[PDB]
Structure formats: structure tokens, C-alpha cells
Amino acid sequence: MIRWGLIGASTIAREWVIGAIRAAGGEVVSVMSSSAERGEAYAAENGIAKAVTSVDDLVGDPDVDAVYISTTNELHHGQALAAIRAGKHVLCEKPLAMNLNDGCEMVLKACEAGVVLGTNHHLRNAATHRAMREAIAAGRIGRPIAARVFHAVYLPPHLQGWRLDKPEAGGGVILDITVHDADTLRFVLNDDPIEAVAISHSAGMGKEGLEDGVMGVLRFRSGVIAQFHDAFTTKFAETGLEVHGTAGSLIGRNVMTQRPVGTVVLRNEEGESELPLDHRNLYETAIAAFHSAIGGNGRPSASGEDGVWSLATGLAVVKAAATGGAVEIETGL
Amino acid sequence: MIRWGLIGASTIAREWVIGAIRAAGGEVVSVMSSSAERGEAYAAENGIAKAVTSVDDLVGDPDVDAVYISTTNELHHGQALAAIRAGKHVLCEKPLAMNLNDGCEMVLKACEAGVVLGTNHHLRNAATHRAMREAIAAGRIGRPIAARVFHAVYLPPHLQGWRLDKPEAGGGVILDITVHDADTLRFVLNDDPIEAVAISHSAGMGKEGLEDGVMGVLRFRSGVIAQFHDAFTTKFAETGLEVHGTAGSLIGRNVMTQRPVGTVVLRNEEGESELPLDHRNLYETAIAAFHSAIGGNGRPSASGEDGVWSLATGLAVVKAAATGGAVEIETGL
Ligand SMILES: NC(=O)C1=CN([C@@H]2O[C@H](COP(=O)(O)OP(=O)(O)OC[C@H]3O[C@@H](n4cnc5c(N)ncnc54)[C@H](OP(=O)(O)O)[C@@H]3O)[C@@H](O)[C@H]2O)C=CC1
Ligand SMILES: NC(=O)C1=CN([C@@H]2O[C@H](COP(=O)(O)OP(=O)(O)OC[C@H]3O[C@@H](n4cnc5c(N)ncnc54)[C@H](OP(=O)(O)O)[C@@H]3O)[C@@H](O)[C@H]2O)C=CC1
């Protein structure tokens, strides 16, 4: 079996990724946590044989083949570099890095190391998004003209779960949600964004206010214009992703969550019908693709390059919102 | 009865406004058309006693009390000024004018003339939009956070209806659709937009291409961020208007057309339910309000000032799309 080591004893690894690794035929052999106590307790609760408290004891363990990183965002880049230096494959939760030169550097070093580097954008693995991508390529909507993304949800400010715990350094809806919208759009449209405009909302007067909502528009290389709406403050808005074309529209409802749910309708001259979907665990699909890539068959679902694309788009959106100006998206890949 | 004269022997006056005037207790006594033949034929077909071919014979007719203007956009400002000089009330199809100083001048001259000046933004008359406005003011969604407008429809390029007829000087989705979205948002939110960002699409390479789609964002004075999507090129997208708040969301579907149709759902902690609506002809409602205003009771549905607001927002959106920069919306009222 491919044996994984975890960097970050996280909620997402517990809820989704550990089970996904095992479902896809791998095994999770070790977990690294900055805290000895947290790592041991987490190892016992999730059936993992070993807990460590150094990154090097994780990535350097001869019996770890691959590393999954789900620590706080600012730790990703350096922990991925350590794994790559140890010659281990890396699946990294977004973001890869906090800036583009660091993200580009990762992709190059992984390539130079001969290891698989993946960004865990989960949504592009859903059968909903895959159906839309495939229907578009099959001409079922003629030429795509416009896209819409709805990702305005409710995330209580500060959690965790014991109360309103650790400092938790932000840092906003754009870098936490919009980047997933960007990657999913790139997947569905099979095309790249070239510029962004945006307006964002921060709580309380311009400050250390959490950026808690954003709306904007991406211009894609094809000419498609794609709007997005991401927030932490709206309880009663369902998520969605739509693509409107010259001969049809695809309407995805409830398709931007972590769970394998949601519908896609195709509307065209015949009327409306639901596309048939075989829903499957997004994370199971991501791990399977990663395992095939390690095997020298195929690529991760989202590559290091996709992660650089999502980071560049996010950074563009932050700048367009802050400056009021349209910003060109350039990856430096 | 209040007796109306028509300036423009138009599709909209035939389909909607003539019948609305009569339903609301007025009468249409004359029609002005630049063509004698068209005006006579139109008068006979629509049961109007008189056709003329000069604006002054229309506005100066002692038996016309009020004037409805639905000519080509560039004629509005000057024809409204003639009516106002003749001391007649004016209901003007959007736009009032092509620039802000001309729109502001109209409002002032109408006020100085002692006549009612209305802009015929039809949508704010619908029971759907009215229900949303009222539910918001009643606290049914807590504090509004975000709005979304969907107005991407199919309008064949060039019509008319005999084939692909007269030159028809454009001039785009922003000034033809976005301005109605703006006015409706102002009505529903009871608040003003203060800045815009946008990206627009023109057919064929940057040129004399028709601007045939736009997406953008308005920042409102309250802090609400409101996105819109308007187009001429999408056949299979339903229209809609939504408002998402801290304690609920209002979802309007099929509510941006001329017809008295559409639904509004309120989603909140109880679930989702349809708001009960008494649908009524939008134009009948607009005329009734105008007739009351002439009577010295109440105001037109949308005033001259609302028309200046819609024009300023439209002009901001054109500039933000052209320049890539956020533009502040200032009415000069
Ligand atoms: N709500 C969210 O957190 C969201 C997260 N993401 C993405 O998912 C990834 C992980 O997120 P998620 O699984 O939700 O995060 P968790 O809060 O479950 O874990 C993240 C990190 O916080 C630390 N931590 C966990 N529990 C405690 C505790 N009781 N006291 C102190 N520190 C603790 C852990 O440190 P250690 O590993 O050292 O034990 C862990 O690496 C991130 O990389 C992020 O990009 C995306 C959107 C929302
Ligand atoms: N599709 C549209 O036209 C849209 C219109 N609007 C708004 O509605 C208003 C009127 O629109 P609508 O009723 O659709 O326009 P119509 O095309 O029906 O009429 C507009 C003008 O075009 C002229 N016209 C009409 N028929 C002919 C013909 N056979 N040959 C030459 N000229 C002709 C008329 O001139 P005359 O009056 O001199 O007879 C008339 O004033 C406008 O002010 C605009 O702002 C808004 C969105 C879309």
C-alpha cells in the first residue's frame, strides 16, 4: 500500500481525508502535530500507529511514501518543501503558498525531485462539476458565454469548537473560498482567467475587520465572463455553479460543499432535464487520482500548477477589491 | 379623464401602455410619429382619434394633459423639455437623457413648471418586487447583506420585425438593461448605490461591437454588495432578483420581465415558503400612480430623480467596464 503521513492533526483529515486514503487502498501510518498530546490523542482516535512532533520525523520516516498537509495556511509552503527534500509526494490543502514566487518554486522543486505534487481543490472531483465539464466539451450548451458561482455560506466567526479559541489569523473569504471557486471554474470551463474585478466587505470600519464577503468578476481567455459571490455571513443562500451558453445552460445547485451532493440541470430547446450523476466521495476521488499519479498513470486531480493558478487568481481578487482596479492574473509559471 | 398624448408610435405603447392608460381611467387622444403614414395607421389600429407629425402639435394640443414618451433614446430629453415647456406632465421611458446634466436639468424644469415628471421603470411596480421591499422593511430577512440580479436574456440582434431593418444605433446592454436592474435594486433595498465595478463583453474584436453582456457589482450606501448579470445572448437563463440577509433570504424567480409573473420565496429558520402575491399589470400600476400624482396625491412610482439615479449608475457601469476602474456614482441632484 501507499503509506501516508499527515502534517496537521486537522478536522479535514479526520472528517474526510483519512477515510479517503484508506478507501482508495492506502494507509495512514503517522501524524505530525506541533503538540505531543494532541498528536497522540488524535492518533489513537483515528487508528494511526504513530504520532510525531517534528516535520522531519514525519517526512523522513522511511515508511511514509506520501504526505498530506492540512496545517494553518502559512505553514504549507515550508512543510511541502521539507517533504519534497525528503523525496516524498505531497498533496497539499490549498494554499500551496502565500505568494506566487513561493508557489512557482514548489512546482519546480517537486518536478526536480521527481515527486507528485497535488493541490487538494476538492470540488473538481465532484460528479456534478465533472458532468458540467463533460457536457460543455460535448457541445451540449453550444459555446459557453457566462458563468456564475454562488458560494455565500454561514461560517461562525472563530472555530474550532471548545468556544472562541485560538487567535486564528484570518484571513478572509477571498483566500479561503474564492480560490476554490476559481479552480472549479478552470476545471469546468477548461480555460484560464485573465483578469479580475471585485468589491469586498469587511466587518466594522475599514481595519483589522475580517473580509467576510466578496463579489467579483473573472474574465476568461475564451471571453466568458464569470461572476462569483463568496461569504461567511449568509445562512440562507444555497451554493451553486452555472454555465450559460449559446445553445443551452447548465445549472448546478448545492454543488460547492464538501459533500457528494447536488444536482445539475441542462436547459435547452427540449426543456429542462436533470443530468444523471453517480455521486462519489470527492476526497476518495482525489486520493485515487493521486495514487495513480504516483504509479506513473495520470496526474493528480488538481496539480501544483492548478494551485499556482488558484493562488494567483485569489491574489488578483484581493488586489482588485483593495484598489478598485481590474487586475491581470499572471501565474509566473 | 386624464388625456394622454403619445410621443412615439411604439411597440411598448401598443403592447402595454395604451391599454394601461385606459385601464387606469385615462384616455389616449393623440399620437405623434415622425411619419404621417405610420402615425395614421397606428392611430387606426389602436383606437386613437388623432395622429400628428410634430412634437409641438402633440404637446401643444389643448386637450392633452399628459405625455408618454417612448421614442428612440436620444430623442427623450428634448421631447420631454418641449412637453414641460407646454406645461404637460411627462412619463418618459428610460432614459430621461444621455447625460447627467441633461437629466438633472429636466427634473429642475419639471419642478419649475409645476408638472409631474416620471421615469417609466416598470419593474418596481411588480407585486414581486413590492413584496421583497415590504418583507425587508418588516425585518423578515434581518439586515440585508447581499443582492443578486439575473437579467441575462435573449434579444435577437436587430428588431423591429420585417427583417433586420433600420440602422438602430445600439447601444448596449448596460444602458438598456442594467439601468432597470439599478432602479429595481434601489426600490427593493430602499437605498442608493455609491460605486460600481464591471466587466463587459462586446461581439467581435474591440470595435463597433455591440456590448452584449455585462457583469458587475454595485456597492450600496448601507454596505450591501449587489451583483448583476445582464445580456442579450443567453437563451436559457431565467431572470431573478435575490436579497440575502442576516436572518433570511428572499429569492425572486422570473421577476425581471415586463409581464406580471414570477415568484418570491422567503428562506429562513422555518424553512422555505412562497410569499403570497397579487400579480397585477406593471404598467397599469405605474399609470395609476402617475394619475394620482397629477391629482396631487402621491408620487409617480419612479420619479425624475429615480431616472437620474438609473442614468448615473448606467454611466458609471459603462465607465468601470471601459476603464477597468471602480467608479463612484454621483447623481449631481
Ligand atoms: N474552517 C476551516 O478551518 C477551513 C479550512 N480550510 C482549509 O483546510 C485546512 C485545514 O482546515 P480544518 O481541518 O478545518 O482545520 P482544524 O482547525 O481542524 O486544524 C488546523 C490546524 O489547527 C490546529 N489545531 C487543531 N485543533 C486544535 C486545538 N484544540 N488547539 C490548538 N490548535 C489546534 C492543528 O495543529 P496541529 O496540526 O499542529 O495539531 C491543525 O493543523 C487548511 O489548510 C485550510 O486551507 C478551508 C476552508 C475553511
Ligand atoms: N427592444 C427594444 O426596443 C427595447 C426598448 N426599450 C425602451 O422602450 C422604448 C421603446 O421601445 P419599443 O417599443 O420596443 O420600440 P419600437 O421599435 O416599437 O418603437 C421605437 C421607435 O422606432 C420607430 N419605429 C417603429 N416602427 C418603425 C418602422 N416600421 N420603421 C421605422 N421606424 C419605426 C418609431 O418611430 P415613430 O415614433 O416616429 O413612429 C418609435 O418611436 C425606448 O424608449 C427604450 O428606451 C427598452 C429595452 C428594449
From Swiss-Prot, chains A, B:
One of its GO terms (molecular function) is 1,5-anhydro-D-fructose reductase (1,5-anhydro-D-mannitol-forming) activity. NADP(+) binds at residues 9-12, 33-34, 38, 71-76, 93-94, 120, 162-163, 283. InterPro entries: Gfo/Idh/MocA-like_OxRdtase_N, Gfo/Idh/MocA_domain, GFO_IDH_MocA-like_dom, NAD(P)-bd_dom_sf. It is an enzyme of class 1 (oxidoreductase). It comes from the Bacteria. The keyword Transport does not apply. Its EC number is 1.1.1.292. The keyword Electron transport does not apply. Signal peptide: none annotated. Disulfide bonds: none annotated. It catalyses: 1,5-anhydro-D-mannitol + NADP(+) = 1,5-anhydro-D-fructose + NADPH + H(+). Keywords: NADP, Oxidoreductase. Belongs to the Gfo/Idh/MocA family. Catalyzes the NADPH-specific reduction of 1,5-anhydro-D-fructose to 1,5-anhydro-D-mannitol. PANTHER family: OXIDOREDUCTASES, TRANS-1,2-DIHYDROBENZENE-1,2-DIOL DEHYDROGENASE. Monomer. This is 1,5-anhydro-D-fructose reductase. It comes from Rhizobium meliloti (strain 1021) (Ensifer meliloti).
